[PDB]
Amino acid sequence: AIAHLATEYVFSDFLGLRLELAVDKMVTCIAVGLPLLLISLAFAQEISIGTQISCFSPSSFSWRQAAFVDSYCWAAVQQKSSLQSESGNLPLWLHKFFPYILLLFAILLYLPALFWRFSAAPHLCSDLKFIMEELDKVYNRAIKAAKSARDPIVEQYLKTKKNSSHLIMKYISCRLVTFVVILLACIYLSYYFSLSSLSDEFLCSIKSGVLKNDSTIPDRFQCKLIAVGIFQLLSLINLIVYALLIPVVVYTFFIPFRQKTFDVLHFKSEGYNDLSLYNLFLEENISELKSYKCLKVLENIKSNGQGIDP
Amino acid sequence: AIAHLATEYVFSDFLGLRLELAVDKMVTCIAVGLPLLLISLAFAQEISIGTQISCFSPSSFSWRQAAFVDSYCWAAVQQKSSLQSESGNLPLWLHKFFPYILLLFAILLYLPALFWRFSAAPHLCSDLKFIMEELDKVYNRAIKAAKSARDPIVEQYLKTKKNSSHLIMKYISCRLVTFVVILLACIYLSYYFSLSSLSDEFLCSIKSGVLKNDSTIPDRFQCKLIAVGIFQLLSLINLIVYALLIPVVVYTFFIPFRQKTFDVLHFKSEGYNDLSLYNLFLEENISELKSYKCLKVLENIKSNGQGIDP
Amino acid sequence: AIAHLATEYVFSDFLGLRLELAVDKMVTCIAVGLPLLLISLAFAQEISIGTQISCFSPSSFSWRQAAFVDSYCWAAVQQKSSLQSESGNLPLWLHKFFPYILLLFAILLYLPALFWRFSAAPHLCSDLKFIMEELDKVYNRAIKAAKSARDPIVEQYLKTKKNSSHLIMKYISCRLVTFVVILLACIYLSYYFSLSSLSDEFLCSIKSGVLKNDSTIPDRFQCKLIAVGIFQLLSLINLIVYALLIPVVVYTFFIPFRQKTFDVLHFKSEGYNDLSLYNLFLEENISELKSYKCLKVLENIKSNGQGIDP
Amino acid sequence: AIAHLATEYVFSDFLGLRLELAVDKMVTCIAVGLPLLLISLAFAQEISIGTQISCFSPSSFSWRQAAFVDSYCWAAVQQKSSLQSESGNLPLWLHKFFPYILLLFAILLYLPALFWRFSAAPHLCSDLKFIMEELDKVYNRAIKAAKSARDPIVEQYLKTKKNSSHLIMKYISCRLVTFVVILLACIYLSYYFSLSSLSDEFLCSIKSGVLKNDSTIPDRFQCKLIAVGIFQLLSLINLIVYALLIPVVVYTFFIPFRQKTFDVLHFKSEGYNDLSLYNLFLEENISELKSYKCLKVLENIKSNGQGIDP
Amino acid sequence: AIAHLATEYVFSDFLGLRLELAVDKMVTCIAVGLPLLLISLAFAQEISIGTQISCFSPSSFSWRQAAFVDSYCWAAVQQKSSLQSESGNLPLWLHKFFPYILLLFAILLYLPALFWRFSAAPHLCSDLKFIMEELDKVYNRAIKAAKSARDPIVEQYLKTKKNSSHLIMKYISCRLVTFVVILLACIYLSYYFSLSSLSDEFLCSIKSGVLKNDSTIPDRFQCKLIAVGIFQLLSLINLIVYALLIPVVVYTFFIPFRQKTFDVLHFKSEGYNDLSLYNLFLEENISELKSYKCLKVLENIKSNGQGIDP
């Protein structure tokens, strides 16, 4: 089934205008997708031995009595009054709930993208639909002029956007939340990887109620959480990748402000202003226009040779 | 399978004109969707140990006798004459039926949306289809006038709607029922989370009938409900999210009345009147009209620069 | 799997012209759909403990001998000569066949709708197709007259329908059968809910044939039907909903006769006559005509303001 | 199920313009696809005996005690304090994680192709769409001239590409990473195949905690990893194929530079320059143009017979 | 499930222009398809008894000790130091890996077809698309001439192909590899069928490590490979069919050279030259042309009666 997981989570896509930037979409796919793969691998039948916990019951216990001990101690992992270990009870909770914790990170990293799709993409879509179709008319006019010579509402409207700073707050906050959640996940995963491997072993007791006086039951059962060594291993993989995402996410703060007389071909940064976002989103969309490509071909020729000024 | 649950309930949509407001639809998706995820996680094989209850049968019992005790005590959870516990029998019922109780909340939170789709959306759809197509003619006429100058049935009909107050009662009652059900669910979930963790343990007896005289059977069996610690944990997650929905739902009462010379571009609140609903539903639909977008572009330019009055 | 059941039976639809009235279709979906959900929930793995019956075999019985007792007593539930209980054998039959009894109600409540689709909808469809297309011509003519002035075969044919009383008998009988089946189901479900919870316990004997003389076999085995407490619980849910459907179904008898100079816009009741049905079915279909909507807009304006008589 | 694996991974394709060269795509399909097949075959039910590990527990151990030993020793494979073997613990880790290691190679060999699809194919696609449609006009003009006689923007633009050397770095680095990962996989697989077959046997001890003093438990359990002989066998198959891919990948470094007055029919190598890539990508795409095929037919005739110069 | 296998592998097809000759495609479907069916039948539940190996453990061994012996001896089949048999260890390897060996033949017989689809079909497709459309013009002209009378680039181009001998090497080598692999499979299958039926029985020992001194374990366990009698039976079926394919494959060497003033209707062999391949591929494609069929009808009439010379 491991090969099906690779087909589902790596070799196929999951989770019109481009209303998300390619880098931001790519980071989201890695950040959300990787925990779901690692959860699926942690319980693959190739690696699983069929149970999360086993306890050494005495030889006199019947098969159902030993099955009770395993089931009770799986519940007792939450119940401080009936546990003992080389450390506190906290590792045992983390070892049990490791699958839910990775799922929680996957969800929390998806919510910023879902919010952008809910709260910002509809407005941006309606604007990009307008701006691109009017830019196409401007480019077709420029082509006809150049082709004849050598064989302003958009400008006004775009100049309004640098006054607005509306979407830039929605964008930067979506980036900033993604950064914080990745950083917190790195802190957790490095802690969980640091836990002693023998923190998977604990002592359990069933002598809570009517059993409390029964001399035939031993006072402590040795139990082991069988998958914990795999969980810690896969936590290192997740930590490595998330540490590599942190530089990329930080770069997405400065891509609008710096890194990416009015010019309708050269989209450029304009500061902490929505026009900087529209410049990014146009540059990832304007290349679909046939007329833009023709003018950029002429500009590249003029940059190298015959002076067909664009 | 946990990764499939995330794909099914988070990373894909489940449960023409927009006949429900985006916030109301979003709240419904969270309120109905979250219990179904949490039910599915509570019985995930990654976390389950294969049975809901285990009882400590004595060593002399055969395998089938011990299987009888577990099956009888699962039934006896409902049967006051054969239970004993540190508290009343009520916790044991809640621990058993936790999956049905979350399912009940999911259903009860869907019924207001289903009623709106049944009782109000058909009438509203027929009106919005009419109003938008006639508004498009008004806008196209205004564009042609403005483009020529600078390079009333709808008004009468809409003025009838502020007399009707028909749909506003259907809408506000759907909001109000959703509020009440979320509030009652919060009261339950906070109670269920408050129950002692050892309320998962109870004493069972099989000595009802012919077995009543059998000296070989112990008078009480120790039983434990194994999943209860997970149910209480997931109840905290559900309580947290529903407490965050309450402010959002309350805001949906005042969005029509306040928060959202006749003006065909600026849709506005008009009180406890159906025109306030039509203003909300138009504002979420009118942005699809090409002619509306052009006039709003001119209005934005006029707001910032050249006085092309819309 | 409980979440899949909710997706299948609540959050999605199951079981052109509208040839069934919305209320009648809605009642049918609830009446037929609810038993199928409740059956599915009664055997959900979240709530099931893997067997319907368990009997306490003695400790000397082998594993296969105890498996024989459970299998024999499941069959013996039908066989009066080998049962004993605190009451008659009738409860034990109902406890065993509870799933089939709910299935039987679901089927019997679907047959009236299936009969309407078989015996009445084809004729009604051919008439509504004719009447609506000729009404559209009448409305378009009235619009052109009104638009010019202020900027009869259908009547003859419809007047024939009030003489026919053909379909009204088919309709009312389909309603009446649905009422009777819901009422009988309420009587059963309230009886089944009233049965003592300990009617799930009975005494079984295997000493029929060659075993009759065997002194090593006990004369009675204690058996318990494990799911019965869930069946009675879910029977209360079904009883509550069906009791709420009864008022709605009764209202569907009087919707044609009363509640819903010839007027082609105001469809109205005409007594125990097929024209009353055609008036109901037109009123649920005529709103799709663009020309009808225009005339109703003018009528609403005339009702409030400028006297553009429709 | 083995026949389904062959259908899925051999007899069907998995993982517009041709934006990847056929040889590079073919190598990627083999390099990524083969580990996924071999993983799937290693756990086929035809060959599996249902468990990864078995340990010889003593005859006095109960069934659940022996199940504990197997589960503990599967976990102990990671835990140096409780292992002994004829060699170090490293082989035991490799034997356990063989499925993940092959999966890791499959992923690492896919990432270069995914990067090309992300970072280079969009720009190349926009250029090839332009260049081919303008070349089609040049060829149609040449056909009309030749057909009449015997019954420059593209040149300027392409001459800019040999100045750029932009895509050649992206391409060669994708090839170079693929080479390195295949070489490292060959080093691992030849090492893993070289491990002694009896490295699948190790000695395990459960005497860690409360069990440490128990005289009834033997100090060492003999355990065997059952699948290891299959893993080493399939590692030889993977090593053989990857060794055959190495010559092919190396050839893909020199295909642009050498091996593959301006001529619009004969695409040719131009050095370490992007024009060399465009020449390769055009030659794999230009054959779709009807006008190119006609001119190549005339060129082939002129090469053999009547001098219809192309 | 056997009936599903027949539906999947016999009664349905698996694995535009015809770019493979019908006989060559048919041989490939049999040669590749038959092993996959026979593998699937060898493990059908109708015939399988649920395990590949069973060993006779002594009566004192616990259930888990006997499960260890079976699992160890399945691994020991590869491990010469712990086997004994009436012959060498080679039969035991073949009995274990019979499913992989048949899979290997299925794959090796598919690779020649995959290579033809990769390396030759694209060029041939581009030529056949050209040649057929120009032949259609020649035939339509000949029809119009004949219909009027009685109520050369292609020739030049095709005459170039007999100089090329390019594709004939690719074709004959694909045929020759298919012949060699079928012949080698026949040699193996006849050997494997010849092995003694009691070669499925071998003696196993677990006394490798700590167990080496244990006097309670017998020195040899009798083991039997349960499916081997089915594998040898199905090997006879595979051998019979492959022996019948050998004559057909050999005939495909001489179909181009012999067996199958320029004539545009009668495609004919021209020696070891690509024109011989084009003649074969045209003859399997030219019959789709309406104009060809008309001329062949006239030729058949002229062959029998009225002299309408084609």
Ligand SMILES: CC(C)CCC[C@@H](C)[C@H]1CC[C@H]2[C@@H]3CC=C4C[C@@H](OC(=O)CCC(=O)O)CC[C@]4(C)[C@H]3CC[C@]12C
């Ligand atoms: C043992 C350790 C030290 C080796 C080095 C770390 C690897 C295990 C890391 C490095 C890059 C990682 C990969 C980076 C990107 C992806 C793609 C991601 O899928 C997508 O983003 C899909 C994108 C699309 O389809 O558009 C799934 C996880 C995966 C394979 C990551 C899995 C883990 C990888 C291979």
Ligand SMILES: CC(C)CCC[C@@H](C)[C@H]1CC[C@H]2[C@@H]3CC=C4C[C@@H](OC(=O)CCC(=O)O)CC[C@]4(C)[C@H]3CC[C@]12C
């Ligand atoms: C289902 C998904 C979407 C959410 C999963 C959330 C859980 C992974 C969280 C919620 C509640 C958390 C627990 C709340 C309470 C505790 C007890 C607390 O215990 C101690 O400090 C014990 C110290 C001692 O041993 O004395 C440590 C954190 C822990 C385990 C938390 C660990 C993480 C948990 C299980």
Ligand SMILES: CC(C)CCC[C@@H](C)[C@H]1CC[C@H]2[C@@H]3CC=C4C[C@@H](OC(=O)CCC(=O)O)CC[C@]4(C)[C@H]3CC[C@]12C
């Ligand atoms: C351990 C606790 C203290 C951490 C904080 C609480 C989280 C567990 C909460 C906060 C927000 C919650 C999420 C808010 C919104 C959604 C979306 C919801 O899906 C949809 O609404 C789909 C919408 C669409 O697809 O259009 C499913 C539940 C989920 C993931 C919620 C799951 C639980 C979350 C992550």
Ligand SMILES: CC(C)CCC[C@@H](C)[C@H]1CC[C@H]2[C@@H]3CC=C4C[C@@H](OC(=O)CCC(=O)O)CC[C@]4(C)[C@H]3CC[C@]12C
């Ligand atoms: C299948 C879905 C759609 C609906 C599920 C509904 C149930 C979750 C409801 C319906 C009937 C309810 C029960 C009706 C009767 C009782 C007994 C009652 O018992 C006591 O008060 C016991 C006190 C004592 O111990 O003396 C407490 C509430 C309880 C468990 C209720 C809990 C919630 C139940 C099970």
Ligand SMILES: CC(C)CCC[C@@H](C)[C@H]1CC[C@H]2[C@@H]3CC=C4C[C@@H](OC(=O)CCC(=O)O)CC[C@]4(C)[C@H]3CC[C@]12C
């Ligand atoms: C514990 C008791 C006392 C609480 C109160 C009773 C509820 C359990 C009842 C009240 C309304 C009932 C619901 C009324 C309507 C429906 C819709 C029905 O589905 C449809 O009719 C689908 C309609 C469509 O999709 O068009 C399925 C049963 C359900 C959820 C019913 C399930 C049981 C509900 C929630």
Ligand SMILES: CC(C)CCC[C@@H](C)[C@H]1CC[C@H]2[C@@H]3CC=C4C[C@@H](OC(=O)CCC(=O)O)CC[C@]4(C)[C@H]3CC[C@]12C
């Ligand atoms: C498969 C679906 C579509 C139909 C299911 C129909 C059953 C649920 C019906 C048909 C025959 C009925 C039974 C016919 C005979 C009997 C025996 C009869 O027994 C007594 O009166 C016993 C009195 C005593 O204990 O002395 C009570 C009704 C009962 C159980 C009936 C209960 C309901 C049954 C099982």
Ligand SMILES: CC(C)CCC[C@@H](C)[C@H]1CC[C@H]2[C@@H]3CC=C4C[C@@H](OC(=O)CCC(=O)O)CC[C@]4(C)[C@H]3CC[C@]12C
């Ligand atoms: C026992 C050993 C010594 C025999 C010789 C080695 C074989 C086991 C090798 C030689 C060629 C290999 C094959 C080369 C190519 C492929 C195609 C590959 O699938 C694709 O590339 C799909 C291509 C497409 O569909 O476009 C899957 C692996 C496979 C069958 C390889 C499987 C292993 C093979 C048969």
Ligand SMILES: CC(C)CCC[C@@H](C)[C@H]1CC[C@H]2[C@@H]3CC=C4C[C@@H](OC(=O)CCC(=O)O)CC[C@]4(C)[C@H]3CC[C@]12C
């Ligand atoms: C889930 C997929 C995508 C990634 C799988 C990565 C693993 C296969 C890697 C990551 C960590 C690696 C391990 C990290 C630590 C060790 C311990 C180390 O131990 C010794 O050197 C023991 C020497 C002794 O016996 O004294 C040898 C390498 C090994 C097994 C490594 C083998 C390969 C592992 C398991």
Ligand SMILES: CC(C)CCC[C@@H](C)[C@H]1CC[C@H]2[C@@H]3CC=C4C[C@@H](OC(=O)CCC(=O)O)CC[C@]4(C)[C@H]3CC[C@]12C
């Ligand atoms: C017991 C022995 C001595 C009887 C004689 C041998 C048969 C078992 C052989 C003779 C012909 C064989 C068949 C020849 C052709 C085919 C078709 C082949 O499927 C295809 O080629 C599909 C073709 C398509 O669908 O286009 C699958 C194997 C099968 C049924 C072969 C199965 C084995 C058969 C029946």
Ligand SMILES: CC(C)CCC[C@@H](C)[C@H]1CC[C@H]2[C@@H]3CC=C4C[C@@H](OC(=O)CCC(=O)O)CC[C@]4(C)[C@H]3CC[C@]12C
């Ligand atoms: C997974 C698919 C695609 C490929 C399957 C390939 C195997 C079926 C091949 C590869 C390695 C081969 C084995 C390599 C080594 C040996 C040991 C060799 O042993 C002896 O000669 C033993 C003599 C003695 O008993 O003393 C005999 C051939 C054999 C079993 C070979 C049989 C066929 C094998 C298992």
